[PDB]
């Protein structure tokens, strides 16, 4: 038996477990797929050969992201500036100026008002103490009823919602405007920050990190689906798909929120969270990179297509790029590569889709979701108490974060904070 | 005798003696020196022979100053834009962008902080109230102190130093922090409204409404300076300078704060204003137009020099115009042209100074001073009770605007205000 079972190989699990492992613990860390990383998913891409990508997370920033950047520091882990922006392709209206932050002069005054509001909204979120517990039950609303009480004018209005449709991964009648403030909250109380933070990119993949962590955890089951969590005896037994049981004085479920409720808890979870876990939180994220021809260098797009946002992603040639487009797979079907021309010639016309990669987060079973984004309602009801232990069960990941949710930094945060209460016990 | 003396002849005085002569009262206005208009004076430049030019008030905004907007279309006044800005000469250092707003993506987060924080601190201010009755006394501080505790970067930093200098007339250790917001709140809780209300010119000069105006005062008496109002009997008398005493049921004190001092009032004033009359505003607002050659039009020029603003205001020929410079009379001589050559070649090297024209407000015994601006720590101790009534002595004027102070809408709006009360007994 083991001091503590870490169930779930992104990085959240990778750090519980090298951690605890560290603090001279027995650690069995089960993964369940054939690859550890999660979320964090770099492989060759399926349209040019011999080239790297990112099919989950990609994105990071040093300041904002304090705990990745101390892993990237810790193992010499190459980093890189993202793709330059310089040439701005905007679908905002012909007021729109061709610049990273499009807004003209004359909506100004408007945007100056509107910040001003978002910022006193987001203010009233303290990070520590949950969304369910702040009396923020007013702020949990359809973002597209909230964002009409602002009246921005048409460029800026269409601006922000392109980016909480891209940030959020969900349309504005699905998003929570809660949830928005959150991620404007995590960012230090800026709405620029939320932007801004996609700095820099792993040079060599995000599987850099992972294998890097993953060569100090000792024992690694890969393949190994945890079925069951029965916390009933004196000692956590941890049952599995096809295998025999394991056994723990600890259980860190490090696994995407959404998958939870494929889990059998004994006993059952506390009754506040079992009505979300069950529904499931409504992130919808889609990331779709694009291989084109005939884009220049340095492309952004932002507008009110179906792809809220279009941009530079990798040069592959001199006339052939990756562009990377998010949007969400309750809108778009990216099965539908007429739909994907049809997203893409929007803003760029005059190029070519040659094929798309990307991966159904959704579809699959050890995810069911991409990153977290709650349905309305759901976080002003219970959100805190969802990475709260019960029992000798501890609950992690980037899903249950209340300090970075949906970023690598929550992943890493969580795991923290289980870990150190392990340790205290 | 009379229903009512007003004394003064500037907008505010104006604006009560015809709305009380229309409401059939029996008023005489007395103007102190040989034209009206006070601090609105349009005349011949000193420069250019045959061009007419604002030495006072020149620039309005329909929709930040609606008794102004009414005025112009009740005697069809003709109104132009002001000055275009197209050309930008800024002295912000190597970072700042040549533009209207010439703040880098750098500084971005940065300013989206300080305008939350700004507004934050403007929004505590009612304009009903006034500054001495809201616990505002924390922000009456030294502008630059206040600044400081912002902490922004430096293109944002000078640029608002230098726009709250070249607004409030006064250097940024006399200005007080609590005024500039009161601006900001004046504005509808802008900052970018302070600036953007410079909209609109008389095409014809003030004087084409200063004399629409005094068409409708059927009793005027010009170079009349009075020195005393006393309400000690049944009838106020006002005494003149070198003339007969004129009485009235009430009188309507229309004339800069900072003559106050020189008038007796008798019985004296209530005793909390008499400190702040005594000292007079903090105001050392100092606007000089400068004819120039080899300026192109449209230039903006804002930074840290002893101008912290130099901008277009006339074509004159293909070679010549006039600039506008804002600065404060404490801080620069105008009476040293080898001072304002070198204010304005810091910012345009290539521009050749031809002379200059002004007008001494602060010199001016009608006047004593530009437009209002308070010490610090004057007007969290005593502001709406300037403008208030003493018996039956009102007090109207910009000066005492708690609604748009410094402004030629705020002379309408008290004379508004005096207007009614005076009606209502
Ligand atoms: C499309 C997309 C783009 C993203 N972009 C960014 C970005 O730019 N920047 C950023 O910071 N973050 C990004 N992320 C978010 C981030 O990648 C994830 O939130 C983070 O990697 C999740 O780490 P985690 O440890 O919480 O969970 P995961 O990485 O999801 O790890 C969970 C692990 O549990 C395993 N598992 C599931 N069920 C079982 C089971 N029952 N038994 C055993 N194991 C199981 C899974 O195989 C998986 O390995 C992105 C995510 C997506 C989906
Ligand atoms: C340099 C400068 C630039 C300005 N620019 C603008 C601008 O761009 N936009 C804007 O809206 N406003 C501007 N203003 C502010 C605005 O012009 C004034 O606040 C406004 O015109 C004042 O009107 P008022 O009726 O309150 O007082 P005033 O116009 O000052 O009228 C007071 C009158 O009282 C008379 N008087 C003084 N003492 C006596 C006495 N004892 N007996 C009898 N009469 C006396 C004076 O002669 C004067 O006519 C500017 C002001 C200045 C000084
Ligand atoms: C009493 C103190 C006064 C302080 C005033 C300082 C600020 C005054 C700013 C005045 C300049 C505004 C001009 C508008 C820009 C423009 O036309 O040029 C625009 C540039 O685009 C923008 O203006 C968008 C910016 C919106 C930001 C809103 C929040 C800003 C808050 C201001 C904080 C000030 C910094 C100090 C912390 C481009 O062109 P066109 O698009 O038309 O094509
Ligand atoms: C979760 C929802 C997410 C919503 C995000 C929407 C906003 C994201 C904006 C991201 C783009 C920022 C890029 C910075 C601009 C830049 O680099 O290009 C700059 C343009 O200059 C500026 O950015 C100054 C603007 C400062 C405004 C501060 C307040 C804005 C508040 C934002 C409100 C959003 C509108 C919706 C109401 C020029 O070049 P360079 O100078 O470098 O030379
Ligand atoms: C940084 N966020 C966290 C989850 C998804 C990710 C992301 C990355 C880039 C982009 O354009 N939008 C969102
Ligand atoms: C509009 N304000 C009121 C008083 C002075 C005036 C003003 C006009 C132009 C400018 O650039 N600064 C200040």
Redesign the pocket.
């Known amino acids: 038996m083991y001091d503590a079972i870490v169930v779930g190989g992104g990085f959240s699990g990778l750090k519980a477990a090298r951690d605890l492992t560290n603090a001279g613990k027995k650690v069995l860390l089960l993964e369940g797929g054939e690859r550890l990383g999660g979320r964090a998913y770099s492989r060759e891409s399926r349209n040019v050969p011999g080239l790297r990508v990112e099919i989950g997370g990609a994105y990071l920033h040093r300041k904002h992201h304090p705990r990745l950047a101390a892993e990237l520091d810790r193992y010499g882990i190459p980093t890189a500036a993202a793709s330059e922006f310089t040439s701005f392709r905007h679908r905002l209206g012909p007021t729109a100026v061709d610049?990273?932050?499009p807004?003209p002069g004359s909506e100004a005054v408007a945007?100056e008002a509107?910040?001003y509001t978002?910022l006193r909204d987001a203010h009233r979120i303290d990070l520590e103490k949950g969304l369910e517990n702040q009396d923020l039950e007013d702020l949990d609303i359809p973002l597209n009823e909230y964002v009409d009480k602002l009246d921005?004018p048409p460029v800026?209005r269409q601006?922000?919602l392109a980016?909480?449709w891209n940030?959020?991964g969900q349309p504005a009648d699905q998003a929570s405007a809660l949830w928005?403030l959150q991620?404007?909250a995590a960012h230090h109380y800026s709405?620029?920050g939320?932007?801004?933070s996609l700095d820099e990119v792993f040079s060599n993949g995000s599987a850099d990190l992972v294998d890097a962590m993953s060569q100090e955890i000792p024992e690694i089951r890969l393949q190994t689906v945890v079925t069951g969590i029965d916390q009933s005896g004196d000692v956590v037994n941890v049952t599995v798909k096809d295998g025999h049981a394991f056994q723990a004085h600890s259980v860190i479920v490090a696994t995407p929120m959404n998958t939870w409720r494929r889990i059998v808890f004994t006993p059952a979870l506390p009754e506040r969270r079992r009505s979300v876990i069950e529904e499931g939180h409504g992130g919808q994220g889609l990331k779709i990179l694009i291989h084109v021809r005939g884009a220049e260098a340095g492309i952004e797009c932002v507008g009110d297509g179906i792809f809220p946002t279009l941009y530079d992603y990798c040069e592959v040639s001199e006339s052939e790029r990756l562009l990377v487009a998010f949007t969400d797979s309750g809108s778009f079907d990216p099965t539908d590569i007429g739909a994907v021309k049809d997203a893409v010639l929007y803003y760029l016309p005059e190029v070519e889709v040659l094929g798309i990669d990307y991966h159904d987060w959704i579809a699959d079973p050890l995810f069911e979701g991409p990153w977290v984004a709650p349905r309305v309602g759901q976080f002003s009801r219970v959100h805190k108490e969802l990475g709260e232990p019960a029992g000798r069960i501890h609950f992690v990941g980037s899903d249950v974060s209340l300090e970075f949710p949906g970023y690598i930094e929550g992943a890493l945060e969580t795991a923290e904070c289980a870990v150190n209460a392990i340790l205290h016990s």
């Open positions: 610049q990273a932050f807004i945007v509107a910040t978002l921005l800026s601006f922000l980016w909480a940030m959020l928005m991620l404007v709405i620029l939320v932007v801004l």
